[PDB]
Amino acid sequence: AAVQVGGWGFAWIDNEDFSPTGLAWRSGEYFALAQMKTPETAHFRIAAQERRLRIYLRGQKVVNGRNLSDPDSRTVNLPFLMQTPQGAPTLPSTYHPDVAVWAKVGSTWQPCVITAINYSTGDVTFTEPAGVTASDGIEIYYVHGDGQFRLRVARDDSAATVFNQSFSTMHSVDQNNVETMIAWPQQVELVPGTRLVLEVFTTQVPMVWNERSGHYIQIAAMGRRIEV
């Protein structure tokens, strides 16, 4: 067969390139949470000692709606909640880098206003909207420090670990910058047929990958077209 390789271009490997595996969370054991399947016409390369790397993964807590007649404050405790060095807007806010609260009103999910975040106790206060009826109608996604994660390259065990950090280190060490910084260890090739698998290991904090989870991944890479 004939193989044509295109020119190299800068590419961010980001969270949007990952798809959920659909695996359910389990305590104290690694499991594939999400995966980046390399396209049939692509080759990606992550450099040895790569430092343009940002990873902020979220834990999940699901609480019941109180079917309020009017909006009201709701306080939920978030085990292993962590502050990241990321720029945070002033509270009240619906966007916050460390916490995102969603409420289901009828059939529609909506972001909730966060009014207080206590990193010392893990308590987060948000305004619950009126008419949240479901027993699982409130989902809270937050940056946590329970356990670790790894990135593996799988073929088609035949899967090699290419990156591994605890959540407490990955989530607390910078950006802006140096001395403490985390570097990608070795050069990695993502050729057609390979999968970059995200595996997580937590004991008490459930982790799901869905449309509301807001996981953040940004890894500097090089990409090129490959045609057969």
Side-chain angles (χ1 to χ4, degrees), residues 1-174 181-228:
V3 79
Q4 189 176 344
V5 300
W8 284 117
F10 181 84
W12 284 119
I13 288 168
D14 62 46
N15 48 277
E16 288 182 353
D17 298 323
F18 287 77
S19 289
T21 60
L23 267 77
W25 180 77
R26 74 286 288 275
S27 174
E29 184 176 276
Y30 269 116
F31 73 95
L33 176 61
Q35 194 175 245
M36 199 228 81
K37 186 159 171 65
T38 308
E40 270 86 84
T41 59
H43 171 203
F44 298 112
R45 178 179 295 166
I46 306 163
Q49 295 304 110
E50 188 50 73
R51 282 162 170 98
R52 300 165 293 173
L53 192 130
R54 259 159 78 90
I55 304 169
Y56 300 103
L57 307 179
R58 305 247 182 112
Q60 183 203 53
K61 185 161 174 173
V62 179
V63 298
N64 62 301
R66 290 173 296 169
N67 189 32
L68 303 168
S69 47
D70 299 285
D72 198 22
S73 289
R74 178 78 171 272
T75 299
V76 177
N77 188 264
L78 308 179
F80 293 83
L81 170 71
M82 251 190 101
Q83 189 177 28
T84 67
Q86 297 183 89
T90 308
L91 296 177
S93 181
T94 61
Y95 176 70
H96 195 280
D98 302 339
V99 190
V101 182
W102 291 88
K104 196 197 196 173
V105 298
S107 289
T108 181
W109 289 94
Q110 64 174 253
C112 297
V113 175
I114 299 152
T115 58
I117 299 167
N118 186 328
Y119 292 110
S120 168
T121 64
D123 286 349
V124 172
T125 306
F126 61 91
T127 310
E128 177 185 344
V132 180
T133 59
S135 284
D136 55 354
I138 300 162
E139 299 176 350
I140 305 131
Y141 298 95
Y142 64 99
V143 179
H144 71 94
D146 174 28
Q148 61 179 327
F149 71 95
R150 65 185 178 184
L151 290 164
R152 315 202 86 191
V153 347
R155 304 281 137 183
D156 67 83
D157 65 308
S158 52
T161 299
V162 296
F163 194 80
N164 181 206
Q165 281 304 318
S166 65
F167 289 117
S168 63
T169 300
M170 196 75 232
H171 298 162
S172 70
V173 166
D174 39 266
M181 62 177 162
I182 305 294
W184 182 272
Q186 314 237 262
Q187 193 170 302
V188 170
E189 308 303 328
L190 295 165
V191 298
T194 69
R195 294 172 283 127
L196 182 60
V197 188
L198 169 66
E199 298 189 355
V200 305
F201 184 131
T202 85
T203 64
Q204 300 168 61
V205 180
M207 293 181 75
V208 300
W209 188 292
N210 60 40
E211 277 186 330
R212 291 175 237 105
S213 55
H215 298 287
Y216 184 79
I217 304 173
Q218 205 192 41
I219 305 160
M222 228 177 248
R224 73 179 174 186
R225 184 106 76 93
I226 290 204
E227 294 287 341
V228 180

